From a paper:
We expressed, purified, and determined the X-ray crystal structures of two AaR2 proteins: one in which the DNA sequence of the expressed protein lacked the intein (AaR2) and a second in which the nascent protein still included the intein sequence (AaR2_genomic). Superposition of AaR2 with AaR2_genomic shows the overall structures are virtually identical, with a low RMSD value of 0.15 Å. Analysis of the AaR2 di-iron site showed clear electron density for only one iron atom (termed Fe1), which was built in with an occupancy of 0.9. Fe1 is coordinated by three carboxylates (Glu127, Glu194, and Glu228), a histidine residue (His231), and one ordered water molecule. The low tyrosyl radical content of AaR2 (0.05 Y•/AaR2) is likely the result of the low occupancy of iron in the active site.
Class I RNRs are composed of two proteins, a large α-subunit (R1) and a smaller β-subunit (R2) that exist as homodimers, that combine to form an active heterotetramer. Aquifex aeolicus is a hyperthermophilic bacterium with an unusual RNR encoding a 346-residue intein in the DNA sequence encoding its R2 subunit. We present the first structures of the A. aeolicus R1 and R2 (AaR1 and AaR2, respectively) proteins as well as the biophysical and biochemical characterization of active and inactive A. aeolicus RNR.
Author numbering:
A (entry chain A), B (entry chain A): 8 to 229, 576 to 673
The structure:
Amino acid sequence: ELVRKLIFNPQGDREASKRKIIKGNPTNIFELNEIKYSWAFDLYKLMGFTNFWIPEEIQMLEDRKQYETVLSDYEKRAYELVLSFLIALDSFQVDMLKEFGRMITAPEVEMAITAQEFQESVHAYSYQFILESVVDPVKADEIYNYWREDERLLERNKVIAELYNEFIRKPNEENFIKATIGNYILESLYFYSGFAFFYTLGRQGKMRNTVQQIKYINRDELCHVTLFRNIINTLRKENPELFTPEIEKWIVEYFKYAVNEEIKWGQYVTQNQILGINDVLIERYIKYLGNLRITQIGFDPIYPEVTENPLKWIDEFRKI
Amino acid sequence: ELVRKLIFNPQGDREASKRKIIKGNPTNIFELNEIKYSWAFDLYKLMGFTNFWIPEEIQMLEDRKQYETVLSDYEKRAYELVLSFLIALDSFQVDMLKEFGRMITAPEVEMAITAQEFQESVHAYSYQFILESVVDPVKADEIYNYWREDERLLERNKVIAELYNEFIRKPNEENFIKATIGNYILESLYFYSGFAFFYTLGRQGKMRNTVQQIKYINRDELCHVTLFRNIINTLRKENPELFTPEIEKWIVEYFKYAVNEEIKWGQYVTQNQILGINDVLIERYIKYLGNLRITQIGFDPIYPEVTENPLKWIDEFRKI
Ligand SMILES: [Fe+2]
Ligand SMILES: [Fe+2]
């Protein structure tokens, strides 16, 4: 049963060295003259100042034409599914990051979480500006609401909320670690069929305006995964009693389930009808990313057969 | 008993016109193609993009010298009290804004709240950079911790937390309106002895580096008051049953108490020892600001005798 810290605790520890990610005894004064977790303060600076971006400064002059006249029925179906789902993911994140931040007892980590919450809001703004820019108003409302029309998308949204809702209903230590892992998996995997698709359209000079918006979102998402990688690894060191064998088993199962679900979404979205990407590239890509992200929080590769990034070329294409 | 909305509500209203500030039935998808509250989306744009600022881009080359050699014992005492208290206020705000945002049921308002929470984090960063820049490390730790040494400052912090803690412990509709009014009063009044002091030092070319940081903070705080003015006025229209006569009476009492407390702090901090400001200017200034802010949420002036801004010259000095 994780207690939400009071606004001010005059019995709080003065010594930054006594900070904990959770269940610390902070004053809740942001005593940032001393930093226990330098990675959190660095990530705040990076997300908040270094990587600041304004969606509306990205010119959108071309995509409405290419959407109107150059995209296939299949390219438009994928555009709609991917953007609908990304809108849902960042909506869930702006809201759930408030739950993580209010339970965190280390100010520099709370600070990094606030910056991430703001970046998720910038993404929501970017999607509204992409759609205002590219499609007609009824079609924009349709893309926002596409879960009402597509059972696969509706179920994706409901599964993501489940893991977050359990912590909210039942805010205990177990439900916190599971929500924390779920957040890491969402930002590790759930963007990446969508990012791979956009960069595919973009490599053939299709929807490059939309693709520019995506490059800024992807940079943000790499910082978000780095923040949660550090939080999880620090939670293991500081609260080992919470990484029971039941929890360690669950993490590997959920990661494998999430890899498989992201692959199927990618396949559903593209259906081998998208030139330059196919169902097998999608499979090895999501398995590559799963191995990378689960190893980085202290587990063995989950797809030993996959060792290479099948889409190595994205690392370079996505750069700004 | 205000229920925190689930991460995703497939029974949610599609129609933006059905949004409420509180107790709406949202999907919790940020459907920003349609905006019920244009003031909230405008304020998001202003706080998030238009008024973006980087504390560390403000050069701090002069203030360490003037602090070292040019400031009186009284000027240094005030610098320390004001900055200690502002550090406390923005710490409380980054943390409490997560509580408002998770209860808000209108996405554009949640979006504006997220931007405000990020601005409070930028302020915390600014204070750390001001102190790293101007004073030695033990003195910086002393300023962060000055509530441990000064009973008036300790009690100021404890009173601010009280009103927020009651909502957190007992999250009902009454405690929400009281916390919402308390937030408006904090950003209306609790900065303004501190801002008046800094602009006084600055008008005589003292601590102008610190004063530049303050101008950016003050611009932010005017946007924060505008956001809460709109939220309160909209809550009155949408939930009139919550503005009982017991609540309306309480708002006028608390505003009057807060005006009087801010004046006393201002007086305590300056003690008529600060050249260009005195105990009577402070009195009329905080009463002017109280009238302005309580009238703007639908009440009669609380100090009828005060009609003019005794420090009219700040309106112009503070501009960027
Ligand atoms: Fe993210
Ligand atoms: Fe503020």
